[PDB]
């Protein structure tokens, strides 16, 4: 019925100080909102993007919002984008909104242009938390290299990891076109020094070249992006989720989620399947909010025993909810976690 | 399924599997439902367990505290005296200290 913070932090420090156990990370949208460049946040959260789209764009937008809200709660950018692409799947879909089509195709391009111009914010000086994480990554010559998964569309991880030049590999091989490779993902025959970074929700520099229906990464073009959450193309998403699932099956695997809101659906299910398949897997869920705001996380914690969910005020461990011993546990904030990692690095 | 009682009944044989005691098992061991016992601290291994100590035997039988001067015995005695003489739980305490 009661827990103490110090013992939990001591256990986590003991865990992170072992090189035998493979380690990974989840950098969701809650990390960029934790750093301030101007008076406004450097990158707003999903609610910020929804508000910006609402106040920036009108009648057909409100009609679409009403149609989706008729059976769903407060929406996100992913919801409206998926709805738009689903409408684009049907050829004569312009009669649903009485817009005769051919206008949604331009509205989605305008939204993509706005998002891609807004997310390009550049990184501030070398004091960023991501720089500390990158420095911690190469500090120790671990025999199992640390993998990183990010749901962010931006490129803060790239800039931070290149400012302190470190081994890196994201799946694309090449110099001019950087053609996406699938085989080299599957044999996993790479030297242990090379780090692995994988973007589950897609980046902003990804361009669909069409024609031969091939994917390539590189310089970000204007308007042409691949921001798709999942899409339904006839794919990086499926193979990359398979890679995550394969990682979760490794013996004595540790995965830490920072700034993740657990509101996604496929990610939660694959995490639950990985936890149930191998009982030796262990997931550290780190949040910065009241625990009552994560119902799916509570259900997963009450279902899967080897999932540790830690919130600001309460914490549920081993299918038993409790409260901290005299908000506490500031480790949920990205800045505090980065400071913790950089102090444990030395 | 009754409780933890000292003294075994039948001894193990060759090949019996040896496990490790988990925190709920420790709660089962170091826990009791008697109203006399009072929590004074936490076990060293895991801090979620209360250290239940009887108070009738502590006073009626006798007590003694022994340790080096650098081990902070004064703080331990102060904490023990403050816990025994809680106003909300023991309004009729009676203690004399020969400082």
Tab-separated table of C-alpha atoms in Angstrom:
chain	number	residue	atom	x	y	z
A	1	UNK	CA	0.000	0.000	0.000
A	2	UNK	CA	3.100	2.193	0.256
A	3	UNK	CA	6.301	2.544	-1.755
A	4	UNK	CA	9.522	4.497	-1.271
A	5	UNK	CA	11.223	6.360	-4.102
A	6	UNK	CA	14.821	5.760	-3.022
A	7	UNK	CA	14.629	1.966	-3.261
A	8	UNK	CA	13.045	2.162	-6.725
A	9	UNK	CA	15.762	4.511	-7.977
A	10	UNK	CA	18.442	2.277	-6.445
A	11	UNK	CA	16.971	-0.750	-8.223
A	12	UNK	CA	16.871	1.141	-11.528
A	13	UNK	CA	20.492	2.265	-11.115
A	14	UNK	CA	21.481	-1.343	-10.422
A	15	UNK	CA	19.622	-2.435	-13.564
A	16	UNK	CA	21.196	0.165	-15.856
A	17	UNK	CA	24.712	-0.738	-14.649
A	18	UNK	CA	24.744	-4.223	-16.234
A	19	UNK	CA	26.165	-4.695	-19.729
A	20	UNK	CA	24.884	-8.260	-20.171
A	21	UNK	CA	21.246	-7.151	-20.369
A	22	UNK	CA	20.259	-5.517	-23.678
A	23	UNK	CA	18.735	-2.066	-23.236
A	24	UNK	CA	16.324	-0.033	-25.357
A	25	UNK	CA	14.328	3.194	-25.176
A	26	UNK	CA	11.040	4.751	-26.262
A	27	UNK	CA	11.189	8.487	-26.991
A	28	UNK	CA	7.591	9.616	-27.472
A	29	UNK	CA	6.239	13.144	-27.983
A	30	UNK	CA	6.461	13.874	-24.248
A	31	UNK	CA	10.216	14.484	-24.429
A	32	UNK	CA	10.308	17.418	-26.914
A	33	UNK	CA	7.657	19.302	-24.926
A	34	UNK	CA	9.995	19.164	-21.903
A	35	UNK	CA	12.534	21.556	-23.488
A	36	UNK	CA	11.842	25.258	-24.037
A	37	UNK	CA	13.653	27.183	-26.774
A	38	UNK	CA	11.500	30.318	-26.948
A	39	UNK	CA	8.696	31.300	-24.577
A	40	UNK	CA	6.569	28.775	-26.474
A	41	UNK	CA	7.500	25.079	-26.259
A	42	UNK	CA	10.013	23.887	-28.832
A	43	UNK	CA	7.590	21.237	-30.124
A	44	UNK	CA	3.961	21.123	-28.920
A	45	UNK	CA	2.312	17.871	-27.921
A	46	UNK	CA	-0.493	16.227	-29.892
A	47	UNK	CA	-3.060	18.531	-28.280
A	48	UNK	CA	-0.951	21.478	-29.423
A	49	UNK	CA	-0.949	20.244	-33.018
A	50	UNK	CA	-4.711	19.675	-32.893
A	51	UNK	CA	-5.299	23.191	-31.554
A	52	UNK	CA	-2.963	24.705	-34.157
A	53	UNK	CA	-4.741	22.856	-36.971
A	54	UNK	CA	-8.122	23.950	-35.599
A	55	UNK	CA	-7.140	27.628	-35.416
A	56	UNK	CA	-5.101	27.563	-38.654
A	57	UNK	CA	-7.060	25.283	-41.039
A	58	UNK	CA	-13.421	25.639	-42.292
A	59	UNK	CA	-16.981	24.402	-42.779
A	60	UNK	CA	-15.878	21.052	-44.206
A	61	UNK	CA	-13.200	20.729	-41.514
A	62	UNK	CA	-15.886	21.185	-38.859
A	63	UNK	CA	-18.104	18.708	-40.717
A	64	UNK	CA	-15.313	16.107	-40.658
A	65	UNK	CA	-14.724	16.784	-36.955
A	66	UNK	CA	-18.439	16.316	-36.247
A	67	UNK	CA	-18.550	13.110	-38.300
A	68	UNK	CA	-15.631	11.598	-36.392
A	69	UNK	CA	-16.916	12.848	-33.015
A	70	UNK	CA	-20.315	11.246	-33.666
A	71	UNK	CA	-18.767	7.980	-32.427
A	72	UNK	CA	-15.318	8.924	-31.059
A	73	UNK	CA	-13.981	11.181	-28.265
A	74	UNK	CA	-11.688	14.231	-28.669
A	75	UNK	CA	-9.611	13.567	-31.803
A	76	UNK	CA	-5.921	13.751	-32.712
A	77	UNK	CA	-3.984	14.577	-35.871
A	78	UNK	CA	-3.545	10.860	-36.561
A	79	UNK	CA	-7.315	10.318	-36.443
A	80	UNK	CA	-8.133	13.039	-38.973
A	81	UNK	CA	-5.233	12.016	-41.224
A	82	UNK	CA	-6.403	8.391	-41.203
A	83	UNK	CA	-9.948	9.545	-41.980
A	84	UNK	CA	-8.664	11.633	-44.902
A	85	UNK	CA	-6.631	8.747	-46.324
A	86	UNK	CA	-9.575	6.364	-45.894
A	87	UNK	CA	-11.717	8.805	-47.871
A	88	UNK	CA	-8.961	8.989	-50.497
A	89	UNK	CA	-9.160	5.197	-50.780
A	90	UNK	CA	-12.700	5.474	-52.171
A	91	UNK	CA	-12.684	7.263	-55.564
A	92	UNK	CA	-16.143	8.871	-55.400
A	93	UNK	CA	-15.816	9.917	-51.763
A	94	UNK	CA	-16.608	13.596	-52.353
A	95	UNK	CA	-20.338	13.167	-51.734
A	96	UNK	CA	-19.893	12.389	-48.019
A	97	UNK	CA	-19.048	16.033	-47.283
A	98	UNK	CA	-20.861	17.351	-50.396
A	99	UNK	CA	-17.539	18.763	-51.618
A	100	UNK	CA	-17.370	16.821	-54.934
A	101	UNK	CA	-13.862	15.567	-54.002
A	102	UNK	CA	-10.548	16.903	-55.374
A	103	UNK	CA	-10.497	19.438	-52.526
A	104	UNK	CA	-9.522	17.058	-49.708
A	105	UNK	CA	-6.493	16.088	-51.791
A	106	UNK	CA	-5.314	19.705	-51.505
A	107	UNK	CA	-6.397	20.185	-47.883
A	108	UNK	CA	-4.278	17.220	-46.784
A	109	UNK	CA	-1.304	18.608	-48.717
A	110	UNK	CA	-1.771	21.972	-46.994
A	111	UNK	CA	-1.917	20.276	-43.579
A	112	UNK	CA	1.215	18.261	-44.375
A	113	UNK	CA	3.043	21.414	-45.485
A	114	UNK	CA	2.014	23.238	-42.306
A	115	UNK	CA	3.116	20.366	-40.067
A	116	UNK	CA	6.430	19.851	-41.872
A	117	UNK	CA	7.233	23.569	-41.679
A	118	UNK	CA	6.220	23.750	-38.005
A	119	UNK	CA	8.193	20.712	-36.815
A	120	UNK	CA	11.444	21.914	-38.406
A	121	UNK	CA	12.693	23.795	-35.341
A	122	UNK	CA	16.428	22.887	-35.165
A	123	UNK	CA	18.201	21.957	-31.947
A	124	UNK	CA	19.568	24.487	-29.437
A	125	UNK	CA	23.083	24.362	-27.984
A	126	UNK	CA	24.963	21.377	-26.517
A	127	UNK	CA	23.010	21.518	-23.198
A	128	UNK	CA	20.037	19.576	-24.584
A	129	UNK	CA	18.984	16.398	-22.737
A	130	UNK	CA	19.305	14.418	-25.970
A	131	UNK	CA	23.002	15.334	-26.028
A	132	UNK	CA	23.351	13.874	-22.527
A	133	UNK	CA	21.592	10.681	-23.628
A	134	UNK	CA	23.854	10.393	-26.679
A	135	UNK	CA	26.927	10.896	-24.487
A	136	UNK	CA	25.679	8.162	-22.153
A	137	UNK	CA	25.099	5.815	-25.107
A	138	UNK	CA	28.750	5.594	-26.178
A	139	UNK	CA	30.178	6.066	-22.669
A	140	UNK	CA	30.320	2.304	-22.009
A	141	UNK	CA	31.436	-0.340	-24.517
A	142	UNK	CA	28.439	-2.578	-23.914
A	143	UNK	CA	28.489	-5.981	-25.602
A	144	UNK	CA	24.800	-5.619	-26.546
A	145	UNK	CA	24.194	-2.263	-28.204
A	146	UNK	CA	21.267	-0.069	-27.159
A	147	UNK	CA	18.395	0.339	-29.618
A	148	UNK	CA	16.195	3.442	-29.750
A	149	UNK	CA	12.570	3.692	-30.886
A	150	UNK	CA	10.992	7.094	-31.526
A	151	UNK	CA	7.440	8.067	-32.455
A	152	UNK	CA	8.482	11.665	-33.173
A	153	UNK	CA	8.309	13.101	-36.680
A	154	UNK	CA	11.168	15.536	-36.001
A	155	UNK	CA	14.936	14.944	-36.183
A	156	UNK	CA	16.173	15.999	-32.731
A	157	UNK	CA	17.637	12.532	-32.149
A	158	UNK	CA	19.603	12.765	-35.404
A	159	UNK	CA	21.039	16.210	-34.660
A	160	UNK	CA	21.905	15.322	-31.061
A	161	UNK	CA	23.541	12.006	-31.959
A	162	UNK	CA	25.534	13.562	-34.817
A	163	UNK	CA	26.738	16.538	-32.753
A	164	UNK	CA	28.652	13.946	-30.702
A	165	UNK	CA	29.614	11.669	-33.588
A	166	UNK	CA	28.526	8.157	-32.627
A	167	UNK	CA	27.856	4.911	-34.533
A	168	UNK	CA	24.367	4.974	-36.014
A	169	UNK	CA	22.126	2.956	-38.345
A	170	UNK	CA	18.448	3.535	-39.150
A	171	UNK	CA	17.841	0.904	-41.865
A	172	UNK	CA	18.439	3.064	-44.945
A	173	UNK	CA	21.714	2.399	-46.766
A	174	UNK	CA	23.181	4.825	-49.281
A	175	UNK	CA	24.597	8.312	-49.787
A	176	UNK	CA	22.677	9.983	-52.637
A	177	UNK	CA	19.217	8.376	-52.508
A	178	UNK	CA	19.600	6.296	-49.306
A	179	UNK	CA	17.492	3.396	-50.535
A	180	UNK	CA	15.634	1.555	-47.786
A	181	UNK	CA	17.002	-1.944	-47.193
A	182	UNK	CA	15.110	-4.933	-45.804
A	183	UNK	CA	17.620	-7.802	-45.943
A	184	UNK	CA	20.258	-6.075	-43.805
A	185	UNK	CA	17.520	-5.539	-41.234
A	186	UNK	CA	16.724	-9.248	-41.150
A	187	UNK	CA	20.132	-10.906	-40.942
A	188	UNK	CA	21.128	-8.515	-38.112
A	189	UNK	CA	24.782	-9.163	-39.030
A	190	UNK	CA	26.248	-5.850	-37.912
A	191	UNK	CA	29.155	-5.026	-35.587
A	192	UNK	CA	28.124	-4.452	-31.988
A	193	UNK	CA	29.465	-0.886	-32.013
A	194	UNK	CA	26.848	0.336	-34.506
A	195	UNK	CA	23.798	1.758	-32.747
A	196	UNK	CA	20.239	1.236	-33.978
A	197	UNK	CA	17.587	3.959	-34.218
A	198	UNK	CA	14.101	3.192	-35.526
A	199	UNK	CA	11.145	5.530	-36.142
A	200	UNK	CA	7.846	3.670	-35.802
A	201	UNK	CA	5.557	6.573	-36.771
A	202	UNK	CA	7.692	7.927	-39.617
A	203	UNK	CA	9.906	10.988	-40.023
A	204	UNK	CA	9.553	14.210	-42.019
A	205	UNK	CA	12.509	13.615	-44.375
A	206	UNK	CA	10.890	10.485	-45.844
A	207	UNK	CA	9.659	10.915	-49.421
A	208	UNK	CA	7.510	8.508	-51.431
A	209	UNK	CA	8.916	8.615	-54.964
A	210	UNK	CA	5.950	6.701	-56.460
A	211	UNK	CA	6.692	5.499	-60.011
A	212	UNK	CA	8.283	2.154	-59.139
A	213	UNK	CA	6.619	2.412	-55.685
A	214	UNK	CA	9.883	2.644	-53.753
A	215	UNK	CA	10.734	4.438	-50.510
A	216	UNK	CA	13.834	6.543	-49.871
A	217	UNK	CA	15.105	8.970	-47.239
A	218	UNK	CA	17.212	12.094	-47.570
A	219	UNK	CA	16.742	15.817	-48.077
A	220	UNK	CA	13.200	16.936	-47.121
A	221	UNK	CA	11.236	18.102	-50.148
A	222	UNK	CA	8.425	20.662	-50.078
A	223	UNK	CA	4.985	19.182	-49.450
A	224	UNK	CA	6.042	15.618	-50.276
A	225	UNK	CA	6.443	13.725	-46.993
A	226	UNK	CA	5.542	10.365	-45.428
A	227	UNK	CA	4.157	11.480	-42.062
A	228	UNK	CA	1.682	8.527	-42.157
A	229	UNK	CA	0.921	7.025	-38.728
A	230	UNK	CA	0.357	3.533	-40.119
A	231	UNK	CA	-1.157	3.953	-43.629
A	232	UNK	CA	-2.604	1.001	-45.604
A	233	UNK	CA	-0.187	0.624	-48.505
A	234	UNK	CA	-0.188	-2.683	-50.372
A	235	UNK	CA	6.343	-1.618	-45.684
A	236	UNK	CA	8.608	-0.206	-42.966
A	237	UNK	CA	5.817	-0.266	-40.369
A	238	UNK	CA	5.175	-4.021	-40.294
A	239	UNK	CA	8.824	-5.108	-40.451
A	240	UNK	CA	9.860	-2.503	-37.868
A	241	UNK	CA	7.132	-3.566	-35.444
A	242	UNK	CA	8.313	-7.135	-36.037
A	243	UNK	CA	11.820	-5.972	-35.106
A	244	UNK	CA	10.492	-4.478	-31.864
A	245	UNK	CA	8.610	-7.698	-31.096
A	246	UNK	CA	11.738	-9.753	-31.794
A	247	UNK	CA	13.743	-7.527	-29.453
A	248	UNK	CA	11.202	-7.978	-26.655
A	249	UNK	CA	11.747	-11.751	-26.905
A	250	UNK	CA	15.452	-11.512	-26.038
A	251	UNK	CA	16.351	-12.996	-22.627
A	252	UNK	CA	16.555	-10.387	-19.850
A	253	UNK	CA	15.532	-7.381	-21.939
A	254	UNK	CA	14.887	-3.952	-20.411
A	255	UNK	CA	12.780	-1.299	-22.147
A	256	UNK	CA	12.232	2.233	-20.820
A	257	UNK	CA	9.431	4.491	-22.070
A	258	UNK	CA	9.789	8.230	-21.442
A	259	UNK	CA	7.036	10.698	-22.255
A	260	UNK	CA	4.733	7.972	-23.581
A	261	UNK	CA	1.003	8.442	-23.022
A	262	UNK	CA	0.004	4.836	-23.897
A	263	UNK	CA	-2.882	6.180	-26.007
A	264	UNK	CA	-1.788	4.194	-29.069
A	265	UNK	CA	-3.403	0.821	-29.740
A	266	UNK	CA	-1.039	-1.365	-31.784
A	267	UNK	CA	1.958	-0.450	-29.613
A	268	UNK	CA	0.116	-1.441	-26.437
A	269	UNK	CA	-0.924	-4.790	-27.906
A	270	UNK	CA	2.544	-5.675	-29.200
A	271	UNK	CA	4.025	-4.695	-25.826
A	272	UNK	CA	1.505	-6.917	-24.031
A	273	UNK	CA	2.251	-9.827	-26.370
A	274	UNK	CA	5.990	-9.409	-25.838
A	275	UNK	CA	5.551	-9.250	-22.066
A	276	UNK	CA	3.382	-12.377	-22.008
A	277	UNK	CA	5.616	-14.380	-24.358
A	278	UNK	CA	8.843	-13.970	-22.367
A	279	UNK	CA	8.351	-13.568	-18.584
A	280	UNK	CA	11.965	-12.370	-18.219
A	281	UNK	CA	11.208	-9.187	-20.165
A	282	UNK	CA	10.878	-6.012	-18.115
A	283	UNK	CA	9.380	-2.651	-19.096
A	284	UNK	CA	9.834	0.596	-17.150
A	285	UNK	CA	6.893	2.868	-17.877
A	286	UNK	CA	7.815	6.434	-16.915
A	287	UNK	CA	5.100	9.101	-16.950
A	288	UNK	CA	4.828	12.734	-15.836
A	289	UNK	CA	1.187	13.088	-14.750
A	290	UNK	CA	-1.413	11.779	-12.309
A	291	UNK	CA	-1.721	8.000	-12.579
A	292	UNK	CA	-5.517	8.253	-12.935
A	293	UNK	CA	-5.111	9.649	-16.478
A	294	UNK	CA	-3.739	6.371	-17.934
A	295	UNK	CA	-6.500	3.756	-17.973
A	296	UNK	CA	-4.811	1.519	-20.556
A	297	UNK	CA	-1.566	1.613	-18.574
A	298	UNK	CA	-3.483	0.627	-15.434
A	299	UNK	CA	-5.100	-2.285	-17.272
A	300	UNK	CA	-1.738	-3.463	-18.618
A	301	UNK	CA	-0.134	-3.204	-15.172
A	302	UNK	CA	-2.993	-5.161	-13.597
A	303	UNK	CA	-2.683	-7.756	-16.381
A	304	UNK	CA	1.076	-8.087	-16.965
A	305	UNK	CA	3.074	-8.598	-13.775
A	306	UNK	CA	6.494	-7.699	-15.209
A	307	UNK	CA	5.422	-4.170	-16.209
A	308	UNK	CA	6.404	-1.356	-13.836
A	309	UNK	CA	4.317	1.816	-14.126
A	310	UNK	CA	5.562	4.847	-12.184
A	311	UNK	CA	3.636	8.126	-11.995
A	312	UNK	CA	4.098	11.402	-10.133
A	313	UNK	CA	1.804	10.634	-7.178
A	314	UNK	CA	1.004	6.904	-7.313
A	315	UNK	CA	2.797	3.833	-8.626
A	316	UNK	CA	1.545	0.344	-9.483
A	317	UNK	CA	4.076	-2.494	-9.214
A	318	UNK	CA	3.399	-6.209	-9.535
A	319	UNK	CA	-0.381	-5.928	-9.980
A	320	UNK	CA	-0.629	-3.931	-6.732
A	321	UNK	CA	-1.383	-0.206	-6.776
A	322	UNK	CA	0.233	2.001	-4.155
A	323	UNK	CA	1.394	5.491	-3.197
A	324	UNK	CA	4.776	7.086	-2.596
A	325	UNK	CA	6.085	7.398	0.953
A	326	UNK	CA	6.413	11.077	2.071
A	327	UNK	CA	4.285	15.256	-5.863
A	328	UNK	CA	7.283	12.907	-5.748
A	329	UNK	CA	9.370	10.906	-8.234
A	330	UNK	CA	10.452	13.751	-10.499
A	331	UNK	CA	12.137	11.159	-12.755
A	332	UNK	CA	9.097	11.285	-15.045
A	333	UNK	CA	10.243	14.627	-16.444
A	334	UNK	CA	12.631	14.268	-19.371
A	335	UNK	CA	15.131	16.768	-17.948
A	336	UNK	CA	15.407	14.873	-14.661
A	337	UNK	CA	15.807	11.539	-16.459
A	338	UNK	CA	18.559	13.012	-18.638
A	339	UNK	CA	20.361	14.404	-15.586
A	340	UNK	CA	20.041	10.993	-13.923
A	341	UNK	CA	21.497	9.271	-16.988
A	342	UNK	CA	24.403	11.706	-17.298
A	343	UNK	CA	25.269	11.432	-13.600
A	344	UNK	CA	25.151	7.624	-13.705
A	345	UNK	CA	27.267	7.738	-16.885
A	346	UNK	CA	30.385	8.736	-14.933
B	1	UNK	CA	-2.820	-21.667	5.355
B	2	UNK	CA	-2.873	-20.663	9.036
B	3	UNK	CA	0.319	-18.705	9.780
B	4	UNK	CA	4.087	-19.053	10.150
B	5	UNK	CA	4.904	-21.179	13.205
B	6	UNK	CA	8.432	-21.893	14.395
B	7	UNK	CA	9.586	-25.500	14.238
B	8	UNK	CA	9.348	-27.786	11.210
B	9	UNK	CA	7.326	-31.012	10.999
B	10	UNK	CA	8.996	-33.128	8.293
B	11	UNK	CA	12.502	-32.533	6.980
B	12	UNK	CA	13.485	-32.293	3.300
B	13	UNK	CA	15.092	-35.171	1.427
B	14	UNK	CA	17.725	-35.430	-1.297
B	15	UNK	CA	16.933	-33.506	-4.468
B	16	UNK	CA	14.330	-31.151	-3.007
B	17	UNK	CA	14.210	-27.841	-4.856
B	18	UNK	CA	15.395	-24.696	-3.065
B	19	UNK	CA	13.678	-21.405	-3.900
B	20	UNK	CA	14.086	-17.780	-2.825
B	21	UNK	CA	11.745	-15.928	-0.480
B	22	UNK	CA	9.722	-13.174	-2.147
B	23	UNK	CA	8.317	-10.054	-0.509
B	24	UNK	CA	4.776	-11.449	0.085
B	25	UNK	CA	6.395	-14.454	1.763
B	26	UNK	CA	8.377	-12.071	3.973
B	27	UNK	CA	5.131	-10.286	4.853
B	28	UNK	CA	3.693	-13.676	5.802
B	29	UNK	CA	6.726	-14.463	7.976
B	30	UNK	CA	7.329	-11.142	9.752
B	31	UNK	CA	3.621	-10.282	10.047
B	32	UNK	CA	1.059	-10.965	12.753
B	33	UNK	CA	-2.530	-10.006	13.521
B	34	UNK	CA	-2.085	-9.456	17.266
B	35	UNK	CA	-2.989	-5.999	18.548
B	36	UNK	CA	-0.100	-5.787	21.036
B	37	UNK	CA	2.713	-5.657	18.476
B	38	UNK	CA	3.848	-2.202	17.345
B	39	UNK	CA	5.804	-1.258	14.226
B	40	UNK	CA	9.187	0.280	15.061
B	41	UNK	CA	10.923	0.252	11.668
B	42	UNK	CA	11.506	-1.669	8.443
B	43	UNK	CA	13.442	-4.802	7.562
B	44	UNK	CA	16.775	-4.166	5.859
B	45	UNK	CA	16.101	-6.236	2.727
B	46	UNK	CA	12.845	-4.621	1.549
B	47	UNK	CA	11.499	-1.424	3.102
B	48	UNK	CA	7.800	-2.236	2.602
B	49	UNK	CA	7.744	-4.549	5.651
B	50	UNK	CA	6.979	-3.188	9.139
B	51	UNK	CA	9.055	-4.406	12.081
B	52	UNK	CA	6.395	-5.504	14.550
B	53	UNK	CA	7.622	-5.592	18.159
B	54	UNK	CA	5.611	-6.568	21.225
B	55	UNK	CA	5.207	-3.917	23.911
B	56	UNK	CA	4.040	-5.993	26.898
B	57	UNK	CA	7.206	-8.101	26.848
B	58	UNK	CA	9.324	-5.029	26.068
B	59	UNK	CA	8.392	-3.313	29.340
B	60	UNK	CA	7.334	-6.095	31.713
B	61	UNK	CA	10.173	-8.536	31.040
B	62	UNK	CA	12.985	-6.017	30.448
B	63	UNK	CA	14.907	-4.198	27.698
B	64	UNK	CA	18.471	-3.117	26.927
B	65	UNK	CA	20.250	-1.201	24.153
B	66	UNK	CA	23.928	-1.870	23.438
B	67	UNK	CA	26.171	-0.361	20.789
B	68	UNK	CA	29.160	1.818	20.059
B	69	UNK	CA	29.022	5.577	20.547
B	70	UNK	CA	29.492	6.150	16.814
B	71	UNK	CA	26.482	3.992	15.924
B	72	UNK	CA	23.989	6.672	16.983
B	73	UNK	CA	22.352	4.855	19.881
B	74	UNK	CA	20.940	8.143	21.191
B	75	UNK	CA	18.794	8.594	18.080
B	76	UNK	CA	17.506	5.020	18.337
B	77	UNK	CA	16.550	5.450	22.000
B	78	UNK	CA	14.883	8.786	21.242
B	79	UNK	CA	12.862	7.251	18.402
B	80	UNK	CA	11.829	4.279	20.553
B	81	UNK	CA	10.704	6.519	23.416
B	82	UNK	CA	8.805	8.805	21.040
B	83	UNK	CA	7.057	5.857	19.382
B	84	UNK	CA	6.039	4.201	22.658
B	85	UNK	CA	4.709	7.472	24.120
B	86	UNK	CA	2.509	8.508	21.189
B	87	UNK	CA	-0.301	10.735	22.432
B	88	UNK	CA	-2.958	9.532	19.984
B	89	UNK	CA	-2.390	5.825	20.705
B	90	UNK	CA	-0.982	5.762	24.273
B	91	UNK	CA	-2.488	8.706	26.184
B	92	UNK	CA	-1.479	7.250	29.578
B	93	UNK	CA	2.233	6.583	29.140
B	94	UNK	CA	4.640	6.821	32.072
B	95	UNK	CA	8.392	7.095	31.469
B	96	UNK	CA	11.325	8.283	33.593
B	97	UNK	CA	14.698	8.946	31.948
B	98	UNK	CA	17.889	9.041	34.028
B	99	UNK	CA	19.780	11.351	31.701
